Design a protein around this nucleic acid. Structure first.
Ligand SMILES: Nc1ncnc2c1ncn2[C@H]1C[C@H](O)[C@@H](COP(=O)(O)OP(=O)(O)OP(=O)(O)O)O1
Ligand SMILES: [Mg+2]
Ligand SMILES: [Mg+2]
Lengths: 554, 413
DNA sequence: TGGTCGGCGCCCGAACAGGGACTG
DNA sequence: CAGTCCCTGTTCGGGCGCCG
């Protein structure tokens, strides 16, 4: 029935009143069910009728469920919520099979009519006012109000969750040895007792709950391995995501692409190496989620590729704390990366990806460390431990990039894994002028309101060049210029600048940028076997400096 | 029951701290909880629900090889919102005399605050949420009934009864300067390590039998000179070797409006080869021994204006090479310094950058009576990932993240 | 016909934010 | 001094996915 648990205190937003929106007509179908529910609901005291003394009202509707004769009754509390005080959500994250420890005995329970078992506070009840229409569109609707957490109220969640934890508080306290993964009203009891004694504790827990008003109907996974839990399938020694069907279609709308990426993103936790870049890319031109969008080659493939991976069944294992937690990662190219965590080779716990290109001027070692974090954070969220690593980047390419970078980048205990495509800095930058090397003096500029500008260089061995740039900017110049001082130079060069914009960009040895021009500088940079690049103040009349200004300042 | 829970309020038009709690460790949660367990059993904290929309991040850090964890909270976002109850109403008189102390000793004692019932109508902000591994259970919340360590008013309100607990040893030894910051207390004197140390141990028998309790430890920040902006010391100069010490002194100039440019700006006026050696004249050679004196002469324009926030900047150089930019305004470097990994087990970037954010602040608090606003060189993700690992500062300095090319690091190199 | 809530993730767009460089 | 651009980051909201 309805629970004796302590009700929860909720007020409204300072100086704000209740909802007063009408009920937008519903099918002759839903009404039929709403009237079939409230009948019982009110009969069970979950809702009390009301009369004229209740000034407020908000709409409601119904929903069918996964192969269920049952309907879910919802209330469009959008307004109320706005006017309702706000709580601190207690649901921090989500449990993950891979974080489950192997247990001798498992059970799964789903509290019945969950919300409707938790009492809404006596004072607030007044706003949950609603109206259930008539079919003959004659008799004025019947009105009621909830006496239990309403389905769709901004607060129900954190309250239920909270209410629940307190209800189990005593059992867990007197049964420290039974793990109980709880999510909303979904209970997963893990025990290390024998079927005998476990099934016995499982009843205790059940009765306890019912005694507190929480019914645990037979929709309780028993000797049900495989258990269905949080969208997975829990087997004695492995687990797997439930049938995850992708949409086979011809012409693709935008949300369609959205459903794909979402799902594949769901897949990406166990089927390894799903890739999405070229499909997400396919969604930059923000438009109508009913608007037909074309499919690209890079996309078309990325689709079918993954679509294949999803054919071969895959699965993951559980966690063993008495054994190191490993994670390895590999490059999938073009800024994407895939990875998995295991403890026993080939029997991994979870898989994943990292396709976020943080920045406009970074390289792989930046994007690799960018991923090592993703994995640690996440990893701690799941095992509250941080994995040892196996990385496709030479034990030195690192002792280089870090002792050489200006920022304090760090990577945990890690080993090397010779498994191409390895990750290595595509080139270096001489930190000492190159003797017997044509010393260029580069620079340029363009004009504010006017169209063009320009840039050029000058050698110490005598050589002059400059080019007429169009639509460029203070930056699109300095760089556009250092681009030629490479092709127009050999294995060994020596460029200098009074700018820092282009100095730092090339000071990170970036090998990937959003600006094609930049890639062109790197591209060339890789080709030369020695290149130095120092800096000297601008417009402070320095040797070989001024000449360049003028040659371009025009 | 005549007690006195001092009433307090947040600034005008300022909600409370609503900051999401972040991932912890098995070891960290196991203690962080084992703590709050006792802490509730002794009414310092009390479980609370969802209906309290206020939250502050929390965590723990074992310390000093007490191999005992201490609970801590990032009240930063609160202290910022907790009105000037700590500013314009109960400021702190700068005991500038601590800069001179031969040997100062720091000792956390805020552990006394938990005997000072806090305004209940205010407790609703001290709400912190503890999480669980793999999200087995939802956030276990709590509130504060007594005084929350690591808060603005937490020390301010207590200081009154504090000073009065001091009179017996603070008047029979007025020679020493005693300062209290957040939770830690500072006792700077001049005595030798044989004596001076044996006394801090007396100030214990005084404070433990007066309530309070507490489980190289000393400091002499002034006993360490800020390394000036040193220049190169060669006997042959190349085209770049010159253009470099040139562009360096071009910026190391706004720190000294009086620093010579032209004599070394003259050595080049044509597109010359970087390798090429071209030593100098006697004027530009006297400029090397001249603009080399301005670098032993303390900068001028440095006024410690308590009206503004102490800012700082840091630099990654090489082998535990980090440098102090403690300043309140552009080029107005109140004091600068460094920090090198000691001759011990060589640690990593972040591990140190953190001590090198803690060390630099330990002083900022003694030499000024407050904390900086660090402009950090690391990446957000990175910092936030491991920073909590290597920290024993019972407080948390405000901070930001910043990436900017070097050659500006040279000037401190 | 359609429509609710909270948690987390991914991606995208927009609105900020701070430097550096120039113009008035 | 300002008022500006360039540029680089951040933050935030939105949609879809998964769970209840
Ligand atoms: N679509 C939804 N909208 C709002 N709340 C939901 C939704 N789905 C689930 N909830 C919340 C409210 C529910 O009371 C609670 C549990 O739902 P659920 O366990 O799936 O069925 P139920 O506990 O309401 O009755 P039953 O045991 O017959 O399935 O979770
Ligand atoms: Mg249910
Ligand atoms: Mg220039």
């Amino acid at each position: 029935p309805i629970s004796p648990i302590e009700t929860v205190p909720v007020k409204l937003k300072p100086g704000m009143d209740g909802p007063k929106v009408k009920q937008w007509p519903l099918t002759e179908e839903k009404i039929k069910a709403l009237v079939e529910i409230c009948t019982e609901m009110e009969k069970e005291g979950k809702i009390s009728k009301i009369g004229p003394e209740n000034p407020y009202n908000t709409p409601v509707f119904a929903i069918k469920r996964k192969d269920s004769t049952k309907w879910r009754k919802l209330v469009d509390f959008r307004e109320l919520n706005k006017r309702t005080q706000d709580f601190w959500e207690v649901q921090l994250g989500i449990p993950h099979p891979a974080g489950l420890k192997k247990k001798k005995s498992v059970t799964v329970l789903d509290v019945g009519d969950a919300y409707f078992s938790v009492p809404l506070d006596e004072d607030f009840r007044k706003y949950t006012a609603f109206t259930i229409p008539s079919i003959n569109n004659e008799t004025p609707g019947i009105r009621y109000q909830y006496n239990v957490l309403p389905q769709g109220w901004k607060g129900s969640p954190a309250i239920f969750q909270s209410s629940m934890t307190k209800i189990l508080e005593p059992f867990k306290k007197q049964n420290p040895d039974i793990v109980i993964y709880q999510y909303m009203d979904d209970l997963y009891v893990g025990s290390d007792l024998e079927i005998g004694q476990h099934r016995t504790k499982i009843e205790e827990l059940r009765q306890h709950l019912l005694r507190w008003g929480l019914t645990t109907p037979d929709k309780k996974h028993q000797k049900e391995p495989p258990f269905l839990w949080m969208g997975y399938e829990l087997h004695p020694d492995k687990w797997t995501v439930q049938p995850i069907v992708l949409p086979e279609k011809d012409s693709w709308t935008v949300n369609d692409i959205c459903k794909l990426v979402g799902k594949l993103n769901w897949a990406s936790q166990i089927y390894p190496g799903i890739k999405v870049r070229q499909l997400s890319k396919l969604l930059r031109g923000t438009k109508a989620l009913t608007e037909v969008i074309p499919l690209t080659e890079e996309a078309e493939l990325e689709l079918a590729e993954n679509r294949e991976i999803l054919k071969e069944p895959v699965h993951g294992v559980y966690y063993d704390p008495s054994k190191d937690l490993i994670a390895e990662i590999q490059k999938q190219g073009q800024g994407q990366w895939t990875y998995q965590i295991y403890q026993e080779p080939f029997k991994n716990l979870k898989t994943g990806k990292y396709a976020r290109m943080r920045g406009a001027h970074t390289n792989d070692v930046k994007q690799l460390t960018e991923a090592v974090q993703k994995i640690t954070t996440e990893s701690i969220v799941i095992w509250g431990k941080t994995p040892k690593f196996k990385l496709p980047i030479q034990k030195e390419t690192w002792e280089t990039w870090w002792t050489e970078y200006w920022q304090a980048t760090w990577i945990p205990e890690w080993e090397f894994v010779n498994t191409p495509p390895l990750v290595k800095l595509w080139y270096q930058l001489e930190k000492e002028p190159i003797v017997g090397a044509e010393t260029f003096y580069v620079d340029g500029a363009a004009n504010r309101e006017t169209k063009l500008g320009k840039a050029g260089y000058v050698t110490n061995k005598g050589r002059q060049k400059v080019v007429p740039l169009t639509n460029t900017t203070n930056q699109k110049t300095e760089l556009q210029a250092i681009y030629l001082a490479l092709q127009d130079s050999g294995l060994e060069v020596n460029i200098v600048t009074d700018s820092q914009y282009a100095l730092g960009i090339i000071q990170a040895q970036p090998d990937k940028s959003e600006s094609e021009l930049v890639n062109q500088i790197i591209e060339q940079l890789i080709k030369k076997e020695k290149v130095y690049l120092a800096w000297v103040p601008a417009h402070k009349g320095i040797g070989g400096n001024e000449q360049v200004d003028k040659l371009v300042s025009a | 029951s005549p007690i006195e829970t001092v009433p307090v309020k947040l600034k005008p038009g300022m909600d409370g701290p609503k900051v999401k709690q972040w991932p912890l460790t098995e070891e960290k949660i196991k203690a962080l909880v084992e703590i709050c367990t006792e802490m509730e059993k002794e009414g310092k904290i009390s479980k609370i629900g969802p209906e309290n929309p206020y939250n502050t991040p929390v965590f723990a850090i074992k310390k000093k090889d007490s191999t005992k964890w201490r609970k801590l909270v990032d009240f930063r976002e609160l202290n910022k919102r907790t009105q000037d109850f700590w500013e314009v109403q109960l400021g702190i008189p700068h005991p500038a005399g601590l800069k001179k102390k031969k040997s100062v000793t720091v000792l956390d004692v805020g552990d006394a605050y938990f005997s000072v019932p806090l305004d209940e109508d205010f407790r609703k902000y001290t709400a912190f949420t503890i999480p669980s591994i793999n999200n087995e259970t939802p956030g276990i919340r709590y509130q504060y009934n007594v005084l929350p360590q690591g808060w603005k008013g937490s020390p301010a309100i207590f200081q009154s009864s504090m000073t009065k607990i001091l009179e017996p040893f603070k008047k029979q030894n007025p020679d020493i300067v005693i300062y209290q910051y957040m939770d830690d207390l500072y006792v700077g004197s001049d005595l030798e390590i044989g004596q001076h140390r044996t006394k801090i141990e007396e100030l214990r028998q005084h404070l433990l039998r007066w309530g309070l309790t507490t489980p190289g430890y000393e400091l002499h920040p002034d006993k360490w000179t800020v390394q000036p902006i040193v220049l190169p010391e060669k006997d042959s100069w190349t085209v770049n070797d010159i253009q470099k010490l040139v562009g360096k002194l071009n910026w190391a100039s706004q720190i000294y409006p009086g620093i010579k440019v032209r004599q070394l700006s003259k050595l080049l006026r044509g597109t010359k080869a970087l390798t090429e050696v071209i030593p100098l004249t006697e004027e530009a050679e006297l400029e090397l021994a001249e603009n080399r004196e301005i670098l032993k002469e303390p900068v001028h324009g440095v006024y410690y204006d308590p009206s503004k926030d102490l800012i700082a900047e840091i630099q990654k150089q090489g082998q535990g090479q980090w440098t102090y930019q403690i300043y309140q305004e552009p080029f107005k470097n109140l004091k600068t310094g460094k920090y090198a990994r000691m001759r011990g087990a060589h640690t990593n970037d972040v591990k140190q950058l953190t001590e090198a954010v803690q060390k630099i602040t330990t002083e900022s608090i003694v030499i000024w009576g407050k904390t900086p606003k660090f402009k950090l060189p690391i990446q957000k993700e990175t910092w936030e990932t491991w920073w909590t690992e290597y920290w024993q500062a019972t407080w948390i300095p405000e901070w930001e993240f910043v990436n900017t090319p070097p050659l500006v690091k040279l000037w401190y190199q």
